[PDB]
Amino acid sequence: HMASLTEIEHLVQSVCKSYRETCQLRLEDLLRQRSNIFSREEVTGYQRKSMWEMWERCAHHLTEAIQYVVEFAKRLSGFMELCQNDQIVLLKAGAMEVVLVRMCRAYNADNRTVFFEGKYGGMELFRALGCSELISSIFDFSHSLSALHFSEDEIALYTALVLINAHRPGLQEKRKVEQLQYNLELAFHHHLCKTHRQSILAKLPPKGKLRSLCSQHVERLQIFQHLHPIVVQAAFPPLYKELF
Numbered sequence: 001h002m003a004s005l006t007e008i009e010h011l012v013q014s015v016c017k018s019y020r021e022t023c024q025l026r027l028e029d030l031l032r033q034r035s036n037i038f039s040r041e042e043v044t045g046y047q048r049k050s051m052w053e054m055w056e057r058c059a060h061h062l063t064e065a066i067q068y069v070v071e072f073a074k075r076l077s078g079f080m081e082l083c084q085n086d087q088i089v090l091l092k093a094g095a096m097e098v099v100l101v102r103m104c105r106a107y108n109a110d111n112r113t114v115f116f117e118g119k120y121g122g123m124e125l126f127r128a129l130g131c132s133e134l135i136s137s138i139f140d141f142s143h144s145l146s147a148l149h150f151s152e153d154e155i156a157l158y159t160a161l162v163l164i165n166a167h168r169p170g171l172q173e174k175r176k177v178e179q180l181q182y183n184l185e186l187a188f189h190h191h192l193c194k195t196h197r198q199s200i201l202a203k204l205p206p207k208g209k210l211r212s213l214c215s216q217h218v219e220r221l222q223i224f225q226h227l228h229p230i231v232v233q234a235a236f237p238p239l240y241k242e243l244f
């Protein structure tokens, strides 16, 4: 009739562990390297690469980032304990939204640059892709998320919830997911209360804004994959087979 703290704390620690063990670079690396910016002629060299050459670097970086999120989902309590159809559903709808959220770590809102291939640069680095609106939309959204000053525990718990969402169309075991969700919600709210950050709940990006930016992103990557497929060693082949 009253909440159990030890279980909640165990869940928080476990999510935050899985998150740490499934990030490309640690937040410390990205933050120190902030002063390491692309020179004007390094910029130039990227701008003079062909559309398809930039696409394959970007697509590879993006696919690897989806793989890391797949890994994160497999390590979450109960996810592996859940039917294959449901796992695919959660990941098909969710993994790229998590990737887009993770980006805020690599983004510096001070000079509006991101870390790409060892150094920081603005959106002009990607000019050969001819994806101006989309890239600026991505930058805008990272800039929005930056103004929240997430900790890594916050990103961990929040991206866990972006993924574990019982409203995704086509789930079978819906009640199991609701339960994993509610537990994640108690874990997140607990942690935020501990750190005096509860007031960020109401400031999180509206759900519709994450969805739209993801739809736009994915629509674009699909056209590019049709026009110039990159070749991928699938880590979750039944998920992969549903999109490629």
Ligand SMILES: CN(C)C(=O)c1ccc2c(c1)c(Oc1c(Cl)cccc1C(F)(F)F)nn2-c1ccc(C(=O)O)cc1
Pocket: 059, 062, 063, 066, 067, 091, 092, 093, 094, 095, 096, 097, 214, 218, 219, 221, 222, 225, 232, 233, 234, 235, 236, 237, 239, 240, 243, 244
């Ligand atoms: C559709 N959507 C809303 C998602 O959240 C979602 C989920 C998984 C995605 C992708 C997107 C996705 O996007 C890509 C990437 Cl990263 C690179 C080239 C093409 C695409 C895609 F065509 F949009 F699917 N790969 N991709 C992916 C990458 C690798 C594996 C694998 O190794 O098993 C599986 C899926």
